[PDB]
Amino acid sequence: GPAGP
Amino acid sequence: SFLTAEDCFELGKVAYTEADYYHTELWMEQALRQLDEGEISTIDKVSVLDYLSYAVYQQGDLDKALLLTKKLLELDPEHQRANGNLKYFEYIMAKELEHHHHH
Ligand SMILES: [Mg+2]
């Protein structure tokens, strides 16, 4: 899971 | 016409909030290009890269998302989400390499 803003 | 880097960033954020990752990448890349050519602006490259990396990941372009994450970390080594993203991408890459070395 890559997190974004 | 002429949009400022901040204009592009704001448009990028509208696209991002609509889950339009195609237009997020276009606007954010334009903002980054204008910053890289030395436009004076209150937006920072790190926030632009944060949205851009996420948008590119959504598009399935993992190599580009990794590159953008590394670029972000060069500018802000302590960024929490980018550090998390990097460890994820490195895990995936380590898995792929492990696979190649057994086959
Ligand atoms: Mg793309």
Author numbering:
A (entry chain E): 4 to 8
B (entry chain A): 143 to 245
List sentences from the manuscript:
In addition, it is shown here by crystallographic binding studies that the POG‐PAG‐POG peptide (with 4‐hydroxyprolines at Y‐positions 2 and 8) also adopts the PxGP mode of binding to PSB‐I as well as to PSB‐II. Calorimetric binding studies show that the affinities of these peptides are lower for PSB‐I than for PSB‐II, with, respectively, K D values of about 70 μM for PSB‐I and 20 μM for PSB‐II.
The α‐subunit provides the N‐terminal dimerization domain, the middle peptide‐substrate–binding (PSB) domain, and the C‐terminal catalytic (CAT) domain. The PSB domain of the α‐subunit binds proline‐rich peptides, but its function with respect to the prolyl hydroxylation mechanism is unknown.
